[PDB]
Amino acid sequence: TITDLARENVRNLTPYQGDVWLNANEYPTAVEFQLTQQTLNRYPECQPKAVIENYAQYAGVKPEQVLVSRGADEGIELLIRAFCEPGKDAILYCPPTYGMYSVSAETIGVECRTVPTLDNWQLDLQGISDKLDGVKVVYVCSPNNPTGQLINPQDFRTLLELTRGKAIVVADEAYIEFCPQASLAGWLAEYPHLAILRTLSKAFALAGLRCGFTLANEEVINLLMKVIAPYPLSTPVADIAAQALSPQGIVAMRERVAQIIAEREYLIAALKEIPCVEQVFDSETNYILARFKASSAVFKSLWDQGIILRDQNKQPSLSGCLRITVGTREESQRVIDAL
Amino acid sequence: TITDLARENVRNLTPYQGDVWLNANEYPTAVEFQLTQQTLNRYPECQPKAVIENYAQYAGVKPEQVLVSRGADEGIELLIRAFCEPGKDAILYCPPTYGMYSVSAETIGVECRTVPTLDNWQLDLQGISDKLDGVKVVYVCSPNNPTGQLINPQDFRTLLELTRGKAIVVADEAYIEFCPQASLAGWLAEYPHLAILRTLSKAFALAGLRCGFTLANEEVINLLMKVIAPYPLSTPVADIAAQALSPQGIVAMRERVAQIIAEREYLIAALKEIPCVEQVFDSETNYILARFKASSAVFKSLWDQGIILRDQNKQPSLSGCLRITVGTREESQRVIDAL
Ligand SMILES: Cc1ncc(COP(=O)(O)O)c(CN[C@H](COP(=O)(O)O)Cc2c[nH]cn2)c1O
Ligand SMILES: Cc1ncc(COP(=O)(O)O)c(CN[C@H](COP(=O)(O)O)Cc2c[nH]cn2)c1O
């Protein structure tokens, strides 16, 4: 059959998996943009100059240290495509974390080496140290998804020393806008093998744009340029993204972050008071992890009411946990009341 | 160095390569669209229902036989990602043809098997027959880029019989809007291993949208779904594409094709009269291949005047040839006068 012609790994593959939507870490409200460049008949630039410069300014890096792609999801893939030789090289991640690291590698055909984090979700530096042989890329989400906490800077120094001249360390900063001070963007000067993933999908409130970035040293960006599609970004996206990255746009973004942090603090306080809520974990992001008694029963009940959360009950060490995206005060009340 | 960590194939890799732009087969004039869906904060559907249904209607296929991607360029990559096992399987194309077939395979790490076409750019069926061992995907551009002619249907039947239960045959119909009658979309019923690439980049005049499609049998589309990025299309693109694919939009498209065919016929007639023009090849597309005496001298001279063409002097059997995209009457005159 046609299926018999497909690659084995593709044949046997784990495909990525009135109501309130608090399940995908998206900003709760739509920010409106309108096209300004009516030049759709022509092919766009590979890397739109306006987008790259506005973002370098914002991130505080040089334009030659930025690469724009279709979301950080593409950034994850590109790194594996340029550095990992399928069948020979490996990827290394630390669960429970973002699922696309393993999906991309499994789709491409690269080995996944896993070293679960410690009980407080911090890095198991000795274990990582023990499994670095044959690893080309290490992914670390900080702040982590789904747990919500930052990785100790001291441990990040250790990981970078361990991988020097052996692997690329990628810090996934998809939610870094919520705790700006914690960004590793300033470490690029000290570490050549450091890469950072950014996105406009969360704090920026532009998930539907599919626009992300990779911050790295020129040598790494240059290698990534050789594996990326010729015109990865559409003109309507590059147009709206440069608009969102204008000074006034950066100011509006910061105001959305502020409003989310305030709503997050309210939500955490209110949930601690709840009986079925055994534990609410602190977060430096736009989502909250919480352990419930009979979480599946609660998940279902809310689901049946039109309140959509993200079950994490199957993730390593997250049994009983549900991830709640922070939305509006009205949506927070709905969850509280429903709980 | 960082470079030493990159894959060998990536290290040694061929990276894709007042004035008049007649060099990229883009429609000469911009057709204006405006966003209608202000929902950018949320993630879009993996495969926008409106885009898929409007295109299935247009192409005359079932929605389950369509897959939308970031241009036909992504369609080329996906097929290799799902069917070719790097280091083990091969791809087969027939030069001189579109360059992305070999670039994608070389980037991914898959072998390229080449069987040059015959002197009239038709398929060398005996040669293909001789090199099918270990090939999973065969690409055939029809009408071909850069030559402009259609592949004999009789020979396509032969290729499909040769590959039955051995490989996927992909017909690249990027320029099929110029010769609709010649589409193989109706053969899907007879051949399970047949895949067709479509795009909105040429006749549709929407290259800046980066929107393409893959027509195939449900079983093939289902396999492709397992290797594609979770949200391959942005909301602004899916919005403008469904607009362009509305009945009235299909009517406007056909009017652009008509205007290009008329301008193409004028351009061919006028160039035959020119001294340095040794031969002008017939085309069923929006570009014309022509052999010039001292083509590089002519290419440069025009280039220095602000008239940008596409040199093909390096392609197998195309020495002396330059590809001219059909634009407006004013642009045709510029080339004629300048010649
Ligand atoms: C930790 C982390 N890293 C990267 C991304 C990618 O976002 P882009 O939109 O820029 O590609 C995300 C975002 N991931 C989410 C939400 O988390 P989850 O519920 O899947 O764990 C949305 C998404 C995009 N592709 C798959 N899922 C991120 O959280
Ligand atoms: C024969 C053929 N097949 C596919 C495509 C892809 O178009 P998408 O925009 O839908 O990805 C093209 C278009 N290719 C061109 C122009 O031809 P050339 O001058 O490169 O030979 C533009 C392009 C897009 N990516 C690389 N080049 C096509 O001609």
From Swiss-Prot, chains A, B:
InterPro entries: Aminotrans_II_pyridoxalP_BS, Aminotransferase_I/II_large, HisP_aminotrans, PyrdxlP-dep_Trfase, PyrdxlP-dep_Trfase_major, PyrdxlP-dep_Trfase_small. One of its GO terms (cellular component) is cytosol. Pathway: Amino-acid biosynthesis; L-histidine biosynthesis; L-histidine from 5-phospho-alpha-D-ribose 1-diphosphate: step 7/9. Disulfide bonds: none annotated. GO terms for molecular function: histidinol-phosphate transaminase activity; identical protein binding; pyridoxal phosphate binding. Keywords: Amino-acid biosynthesis, Aminotransferase, Histidine biosynthesis, Pyridoxal phosphate, Transferase. Its EC number is 2.6.1.9. Gene3D superfamilies: Aspartate Aminotransferase, domain 1, Type I PLP-dependent aspartate aminotransferase-like (Major domain). Signal peptide: none annotated. Its cofactor is pyridoxal 5'-phosphate. It is an enzyme of class 2 (transferase). Transmembrane segments: none annotated. The keyword Amino-acid biosynthesis applies. It catalyses: L-histidinol phosphate + 2-oxoglutarate = 3-(imidazol-4-yl)-2-oxopropyl phosphate + L-glutamate. Homodimer. This is Histidinol-phosphate aminotransferase. It comes from Escherichia coli (strain K12). The gene is hisC.
